[PDB]
PDB file of N, CA and C and ligand atoms in Angstrom:
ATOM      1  N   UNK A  36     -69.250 185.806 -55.860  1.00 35.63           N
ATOM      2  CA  UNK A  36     -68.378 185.949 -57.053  1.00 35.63           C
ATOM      3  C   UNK A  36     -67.337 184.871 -57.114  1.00 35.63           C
ATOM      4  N   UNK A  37     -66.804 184.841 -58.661  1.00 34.28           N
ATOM      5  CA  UNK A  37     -65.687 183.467 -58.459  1.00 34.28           C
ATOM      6  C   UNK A  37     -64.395 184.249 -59.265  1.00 34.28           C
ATOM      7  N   UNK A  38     -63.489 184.390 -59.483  1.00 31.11           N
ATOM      8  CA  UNK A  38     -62.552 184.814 -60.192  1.00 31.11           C
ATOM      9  C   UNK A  38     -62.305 184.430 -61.349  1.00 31.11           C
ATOM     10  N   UNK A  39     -61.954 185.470 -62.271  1.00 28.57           N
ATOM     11  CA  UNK A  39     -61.649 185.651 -63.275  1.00 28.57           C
ATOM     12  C   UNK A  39     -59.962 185.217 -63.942  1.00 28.57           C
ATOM     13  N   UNK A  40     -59.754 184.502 -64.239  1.00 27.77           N
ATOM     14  CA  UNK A  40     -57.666 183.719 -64.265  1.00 27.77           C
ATOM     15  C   UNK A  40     -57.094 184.822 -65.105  1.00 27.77           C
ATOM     16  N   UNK A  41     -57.851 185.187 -65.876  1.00 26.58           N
ATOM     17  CA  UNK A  41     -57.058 185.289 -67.338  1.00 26.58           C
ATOM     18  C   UNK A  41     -56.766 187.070 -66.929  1.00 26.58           C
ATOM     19  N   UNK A  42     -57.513 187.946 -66.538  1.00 27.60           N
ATOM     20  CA  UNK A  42     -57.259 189.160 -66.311  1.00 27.60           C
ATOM     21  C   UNK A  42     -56.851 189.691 -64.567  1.00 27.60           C
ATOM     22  N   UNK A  43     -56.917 188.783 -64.375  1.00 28.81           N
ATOM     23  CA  UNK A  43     -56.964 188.913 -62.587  1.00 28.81           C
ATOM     24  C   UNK A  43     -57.961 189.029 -62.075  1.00 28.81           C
ATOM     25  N   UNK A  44     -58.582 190.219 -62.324  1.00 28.77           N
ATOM     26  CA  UNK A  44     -59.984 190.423 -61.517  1.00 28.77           C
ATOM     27  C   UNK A  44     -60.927 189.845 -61.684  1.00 28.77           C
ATOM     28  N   UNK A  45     -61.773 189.979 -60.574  1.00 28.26           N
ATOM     29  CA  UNK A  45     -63.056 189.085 -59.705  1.00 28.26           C
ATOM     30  C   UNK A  45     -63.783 189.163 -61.171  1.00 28.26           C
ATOM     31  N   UNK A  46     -64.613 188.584 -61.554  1.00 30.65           N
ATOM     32  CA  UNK A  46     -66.437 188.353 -62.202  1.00 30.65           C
ATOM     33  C   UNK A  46     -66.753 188.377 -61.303  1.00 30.65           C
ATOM     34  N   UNK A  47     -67.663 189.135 -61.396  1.00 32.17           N
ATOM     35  CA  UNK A  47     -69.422 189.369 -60.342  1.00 32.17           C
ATOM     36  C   UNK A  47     -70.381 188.829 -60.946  1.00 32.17           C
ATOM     37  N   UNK A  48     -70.813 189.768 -62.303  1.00 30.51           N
ATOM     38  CA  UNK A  48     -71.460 189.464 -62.841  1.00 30.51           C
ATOM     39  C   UNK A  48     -72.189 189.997 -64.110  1.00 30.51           C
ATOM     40  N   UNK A  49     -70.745 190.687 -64.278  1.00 31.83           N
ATOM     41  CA  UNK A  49     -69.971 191.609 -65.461  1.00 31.83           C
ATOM     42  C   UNK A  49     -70.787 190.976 -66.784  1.00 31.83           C
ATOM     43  N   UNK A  50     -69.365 190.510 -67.507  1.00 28.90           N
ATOM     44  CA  UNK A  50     -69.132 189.359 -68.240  1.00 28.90           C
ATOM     45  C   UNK A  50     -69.885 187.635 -68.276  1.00 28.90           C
ATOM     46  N   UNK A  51     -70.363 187.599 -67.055  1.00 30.46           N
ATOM     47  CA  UNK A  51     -70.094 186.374 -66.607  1.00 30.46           C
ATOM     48  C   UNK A  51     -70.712 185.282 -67.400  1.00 30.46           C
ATOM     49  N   UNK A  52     -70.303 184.038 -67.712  1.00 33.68           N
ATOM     50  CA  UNK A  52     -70.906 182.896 -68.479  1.00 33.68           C
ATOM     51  C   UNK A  52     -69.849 181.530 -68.061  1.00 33.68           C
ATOM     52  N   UNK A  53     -70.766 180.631 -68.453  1.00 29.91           N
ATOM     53  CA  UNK A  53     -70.247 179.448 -68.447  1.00 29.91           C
ATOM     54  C   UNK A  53     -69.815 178.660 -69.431  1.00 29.91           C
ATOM     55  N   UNK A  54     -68.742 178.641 -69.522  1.00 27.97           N
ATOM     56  CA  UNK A  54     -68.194 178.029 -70.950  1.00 27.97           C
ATOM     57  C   UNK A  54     -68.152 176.376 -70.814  1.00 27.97           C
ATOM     58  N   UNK A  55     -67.280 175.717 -70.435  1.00 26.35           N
ATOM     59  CA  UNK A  55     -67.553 174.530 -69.876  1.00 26.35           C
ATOM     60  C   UNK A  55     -68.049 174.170 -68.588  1.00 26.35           C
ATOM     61  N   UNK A  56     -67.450 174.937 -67.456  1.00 26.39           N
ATOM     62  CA  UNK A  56     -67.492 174.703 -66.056  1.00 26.39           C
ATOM     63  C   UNK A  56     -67.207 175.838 -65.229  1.00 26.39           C
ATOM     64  N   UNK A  57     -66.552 176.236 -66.117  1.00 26.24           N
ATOM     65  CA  UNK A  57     -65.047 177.443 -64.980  1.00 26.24           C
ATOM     66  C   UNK A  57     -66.004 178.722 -65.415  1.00 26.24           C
ATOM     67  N   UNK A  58     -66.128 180.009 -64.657  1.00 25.22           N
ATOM     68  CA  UNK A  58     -66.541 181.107 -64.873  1.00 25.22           C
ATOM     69  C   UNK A  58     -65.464 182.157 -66.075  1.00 25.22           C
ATOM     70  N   UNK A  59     -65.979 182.953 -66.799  1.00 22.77           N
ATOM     71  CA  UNK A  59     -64.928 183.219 -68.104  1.00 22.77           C
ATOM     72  C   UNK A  59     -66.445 184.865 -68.177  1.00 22.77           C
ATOM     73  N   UNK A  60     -65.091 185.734 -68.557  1.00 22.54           N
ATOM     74  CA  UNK A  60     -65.682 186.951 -69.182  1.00 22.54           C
ATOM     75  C   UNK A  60     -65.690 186.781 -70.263  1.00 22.54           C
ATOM     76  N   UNK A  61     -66.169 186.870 -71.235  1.00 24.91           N
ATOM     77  CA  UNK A  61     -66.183 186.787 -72.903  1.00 24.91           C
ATOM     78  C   UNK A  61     -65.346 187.486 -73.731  1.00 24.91           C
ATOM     79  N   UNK A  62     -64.242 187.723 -73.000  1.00 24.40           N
ATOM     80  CA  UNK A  62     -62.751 188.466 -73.728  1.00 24.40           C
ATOM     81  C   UNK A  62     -61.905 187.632 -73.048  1.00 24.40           C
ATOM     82  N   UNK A  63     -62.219 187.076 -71.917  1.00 23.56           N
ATOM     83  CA  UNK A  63     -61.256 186.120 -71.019  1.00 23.56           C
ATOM     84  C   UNK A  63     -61.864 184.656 -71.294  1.00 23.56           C
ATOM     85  N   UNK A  64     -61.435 184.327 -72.582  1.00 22.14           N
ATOM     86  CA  UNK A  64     -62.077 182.765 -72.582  1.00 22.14           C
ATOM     87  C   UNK A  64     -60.355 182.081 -72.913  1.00 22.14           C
ATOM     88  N   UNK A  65     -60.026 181.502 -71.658  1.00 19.96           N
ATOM     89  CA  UNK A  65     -58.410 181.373 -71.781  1.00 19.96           C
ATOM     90  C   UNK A  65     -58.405 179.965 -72.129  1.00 19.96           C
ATOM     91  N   UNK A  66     -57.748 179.258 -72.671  1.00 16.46           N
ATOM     92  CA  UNK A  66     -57.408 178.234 -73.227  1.00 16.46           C
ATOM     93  C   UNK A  66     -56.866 177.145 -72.363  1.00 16.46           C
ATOM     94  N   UNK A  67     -56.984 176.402 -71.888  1.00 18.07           N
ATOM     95  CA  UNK A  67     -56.286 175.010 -71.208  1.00 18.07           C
ATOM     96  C   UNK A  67     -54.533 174.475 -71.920  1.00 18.07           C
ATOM     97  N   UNK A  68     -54.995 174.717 -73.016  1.00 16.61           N
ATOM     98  CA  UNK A  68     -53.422 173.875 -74.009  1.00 16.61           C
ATOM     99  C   UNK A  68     -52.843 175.781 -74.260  1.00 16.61           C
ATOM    100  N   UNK A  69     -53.630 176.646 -75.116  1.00 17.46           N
ATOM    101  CA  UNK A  69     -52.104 177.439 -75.239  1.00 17.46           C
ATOM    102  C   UNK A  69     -52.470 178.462 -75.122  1.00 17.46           C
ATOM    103  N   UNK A  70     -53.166 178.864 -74.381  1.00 17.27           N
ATOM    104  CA  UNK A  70     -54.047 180.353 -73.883  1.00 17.27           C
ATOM    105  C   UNK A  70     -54.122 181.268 -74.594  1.00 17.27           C
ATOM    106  N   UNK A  71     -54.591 181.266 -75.426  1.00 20.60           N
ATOM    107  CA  UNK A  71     -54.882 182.196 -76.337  1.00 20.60           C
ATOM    108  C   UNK A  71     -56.520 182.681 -75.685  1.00 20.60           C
ATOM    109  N   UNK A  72     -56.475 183.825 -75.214  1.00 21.26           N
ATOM    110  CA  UNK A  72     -58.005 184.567 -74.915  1.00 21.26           C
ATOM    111  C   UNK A  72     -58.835 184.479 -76.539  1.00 21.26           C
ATOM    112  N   UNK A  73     -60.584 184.157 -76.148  1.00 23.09           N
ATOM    113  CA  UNK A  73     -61.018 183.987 -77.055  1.00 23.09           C
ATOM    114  C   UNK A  73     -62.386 184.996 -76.569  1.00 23.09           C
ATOM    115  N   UNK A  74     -63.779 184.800 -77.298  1.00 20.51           N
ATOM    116  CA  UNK A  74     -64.552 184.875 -77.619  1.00 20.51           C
ATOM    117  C   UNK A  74     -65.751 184.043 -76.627  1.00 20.51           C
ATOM    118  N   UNK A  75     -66.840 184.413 -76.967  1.00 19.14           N
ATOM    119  CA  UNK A  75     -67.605 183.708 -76.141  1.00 19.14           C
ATOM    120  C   UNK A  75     -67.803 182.255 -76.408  1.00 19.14           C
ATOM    121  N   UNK A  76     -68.678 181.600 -76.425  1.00 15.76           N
ATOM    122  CA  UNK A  76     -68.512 179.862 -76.373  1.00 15.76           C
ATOM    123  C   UNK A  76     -69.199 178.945 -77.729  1.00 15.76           C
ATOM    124  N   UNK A  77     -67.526 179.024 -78.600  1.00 16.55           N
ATOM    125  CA  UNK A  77     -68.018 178.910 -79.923  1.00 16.55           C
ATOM    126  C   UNK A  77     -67.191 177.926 -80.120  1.00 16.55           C
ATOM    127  N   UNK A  78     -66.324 177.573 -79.075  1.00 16.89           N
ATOM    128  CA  UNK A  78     -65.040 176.249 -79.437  1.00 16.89           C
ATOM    129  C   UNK A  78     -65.456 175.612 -78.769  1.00 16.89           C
ATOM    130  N   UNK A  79     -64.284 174.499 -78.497  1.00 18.55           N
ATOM    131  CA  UNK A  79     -64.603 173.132 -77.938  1.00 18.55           C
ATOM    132  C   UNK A  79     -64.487 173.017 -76.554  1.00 18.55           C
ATOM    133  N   UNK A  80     -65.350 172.331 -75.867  1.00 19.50           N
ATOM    134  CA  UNK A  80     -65.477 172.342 -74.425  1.00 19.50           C
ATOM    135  C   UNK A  80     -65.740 171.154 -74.211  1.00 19.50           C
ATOM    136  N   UNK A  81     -64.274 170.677 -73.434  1.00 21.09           N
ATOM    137  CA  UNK A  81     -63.973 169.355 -72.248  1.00 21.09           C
ATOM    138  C   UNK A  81     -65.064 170.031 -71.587  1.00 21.09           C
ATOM    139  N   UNK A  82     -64.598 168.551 -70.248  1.00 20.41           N
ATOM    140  CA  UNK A  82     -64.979 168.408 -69.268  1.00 20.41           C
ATOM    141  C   UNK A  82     -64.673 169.377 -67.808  1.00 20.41           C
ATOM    142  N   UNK A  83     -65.458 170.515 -68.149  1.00 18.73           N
ATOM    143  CA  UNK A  83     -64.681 171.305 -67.021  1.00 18.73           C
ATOM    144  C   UNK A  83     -63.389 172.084 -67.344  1.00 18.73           C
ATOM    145  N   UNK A  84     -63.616 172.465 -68.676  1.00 19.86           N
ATOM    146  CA  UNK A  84     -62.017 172.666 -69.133  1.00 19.86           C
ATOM    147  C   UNK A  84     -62.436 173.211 -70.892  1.00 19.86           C
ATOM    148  N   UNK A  85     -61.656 174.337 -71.210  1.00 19.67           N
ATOM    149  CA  UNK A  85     -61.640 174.788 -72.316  1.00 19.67           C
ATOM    150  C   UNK A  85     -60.604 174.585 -73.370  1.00 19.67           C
ATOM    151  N   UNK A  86     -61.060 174.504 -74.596  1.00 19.55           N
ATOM    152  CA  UNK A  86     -59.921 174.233 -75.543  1.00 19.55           C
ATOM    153  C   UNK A  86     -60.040 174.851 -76.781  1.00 19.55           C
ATOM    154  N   UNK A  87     -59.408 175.249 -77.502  1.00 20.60           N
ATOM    155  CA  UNK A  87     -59.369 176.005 -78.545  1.00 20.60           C
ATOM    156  C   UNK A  87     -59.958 175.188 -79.743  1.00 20.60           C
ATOM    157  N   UNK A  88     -60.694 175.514 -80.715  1.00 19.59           N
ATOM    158  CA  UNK A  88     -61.402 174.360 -81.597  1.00 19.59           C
ATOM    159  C   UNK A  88     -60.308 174.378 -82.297  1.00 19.59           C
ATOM    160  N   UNK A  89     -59.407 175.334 -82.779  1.00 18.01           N
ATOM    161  CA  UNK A  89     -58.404 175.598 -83.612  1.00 18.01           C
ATOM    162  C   UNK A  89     -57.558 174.278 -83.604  1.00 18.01           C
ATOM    163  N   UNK A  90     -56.748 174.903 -82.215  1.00 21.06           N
ATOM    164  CA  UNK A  90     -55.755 174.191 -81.650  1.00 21.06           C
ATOM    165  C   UNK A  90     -55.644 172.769 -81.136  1.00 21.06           C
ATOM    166  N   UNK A  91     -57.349 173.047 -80.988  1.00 24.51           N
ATOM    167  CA  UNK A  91     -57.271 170.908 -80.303  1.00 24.51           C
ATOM    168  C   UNK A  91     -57.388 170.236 -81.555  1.00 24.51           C
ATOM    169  N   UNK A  92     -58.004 170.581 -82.391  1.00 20.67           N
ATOM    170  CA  UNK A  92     -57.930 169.890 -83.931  1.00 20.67           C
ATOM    171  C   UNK A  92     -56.414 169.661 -84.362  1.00 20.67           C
ATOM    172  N   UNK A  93     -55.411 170.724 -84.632  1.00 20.55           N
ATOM    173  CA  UNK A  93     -54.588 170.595 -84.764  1.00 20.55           C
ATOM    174  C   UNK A  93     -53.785 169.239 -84.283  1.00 20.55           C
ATOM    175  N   UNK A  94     -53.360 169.468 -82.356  1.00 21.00           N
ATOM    176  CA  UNK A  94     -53.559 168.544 -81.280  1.00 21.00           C
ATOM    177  C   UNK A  94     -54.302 167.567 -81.511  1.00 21.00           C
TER     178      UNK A  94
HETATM  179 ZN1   ZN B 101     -61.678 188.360 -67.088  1.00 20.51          ZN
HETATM  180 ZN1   ZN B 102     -55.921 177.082 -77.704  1.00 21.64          ZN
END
Protein backbone atom coordinates (compact mmCIF):
# COMPACT_ATOMS: atom_id res chain seq x y z
CA UNK A 1 0.00 0.00 0.00
CA UNK A 2 1.10 3.73 -0.48
CA UNK A 3 -0.76 6.54 1.34
CA UNK A 4 -3.38 8.49 0.76
CA UNK A 5 -2.27 12.80 1.62
CA UNK A 6 -5.44 14.25 1.29
CA UNK A 7 -7.58 12.12 3.93
CA UNK A 8 -4.84 10.54 5.93
CA UNK A 9 -5.49 7.09 5.47
CA UNK A 10 -3.58 4.29 3.74
CA UNK A 11 -5.06 3.22 -0.12
CA UNK A 12 -4.82 -0.42 -0.42
CA UNK A 13 -6.78 -0.76 -2.96
CA UNK A 14 -9.98 0.92 -2.18
CA UNK A 15 -10.16 3.84 -4.41
CA UNK A 16 -6.97 3.38 -5.87
CA UNK A 17 -5.79 5.01 -9.36
CA UNK A 18 -3.20 6.80 -10.91
CA UNK A 19 -3.67 10.20 -11.76
CA UNK A 20 -0.34 11.47 -12.80
CA UNK A 21 2.14 9.50 -10.65
CA UNK A 22 1.11 9.82 -6.98
CA UNK A 23 -1.62 7.23 -5.75
CA UNK A 24 -5.20 9.33 -5.23
CA UNK A 25 -8.72 7.89 -4.13
CA UNK A 26 -11.18 9.46 -6.50
CA UNK A 27 -12.64 11.91 -3.82
CA UNK A 28 -8.95 12.56 -2.81
CA UNK A 29 -7.65 13.99 -6.07
CA UNK A 30 -5.74 16.94 -4.15
CA UNK A 31 -4.35 19.63 -6.09
CA UNK A 32 -0.53 20.68 -6.18
CA UNK A 33 -1.34 24.75 -6.51
CA UNK A 34 -4.64 25.06 -4.29
CA UNK A 35 -6.02 21.77 -3.11
CA UNK A 36 -9.11 21.68 -3.87
CA UNK A 37 -10.16 17.65 -3.72
CA UNK A 38 -11.48 16.63 -7.06
CA UNK A 39 -12.84 13.84 -9.06
CA UNK A 40 -11.28 11.17 -10.87
CA UNK A 41 -8.72 12.03 -13.77
CA UNK A 42 -10.40 14.58 -15.88
CA UNK A 43 -7.85 17.64 -15.28
CA UNK A 44 -4.52 18.38 -16.01
CA UNK A 45 -1.64 16.21 -15.16
CA UNK A 46 2.15 17.39 -14.78
CA UNK A 47 4.77 15.45 -14.39
CA UNK A 48 4.22 13.45 -11.35
CA UNK A 49 2.05 16.07 -10.02
CA UNK A 50 -1.63 17.19 -10.24
CA UNK A 51 -3.25 20.37 -11.18
CA UNK A 52 -6.53 21.66 -11.40
CA UNK A 53 -7.60 22.26 -15.23
CA UNK A 54 -9.59 25.14 -13.70
CA UNK A 55 -6.98 26.72 -11.82
CA UNK A 56 -3.82 26.10 -13.94
CA UNK A 57 -5.61 27.82 -16.85
CA UNK A 58 -6.37 30.57 -14.79
CA UNK A 59 -2.42 30.36 -13.49
ZN1 LIG B 1 -7.94 9.39 0.29
ZN1 LIG C 1 -6.42 23.50 -8.18
Amino acid sequence: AEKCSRCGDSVYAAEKVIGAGKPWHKNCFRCAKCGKSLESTTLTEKEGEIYCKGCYAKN
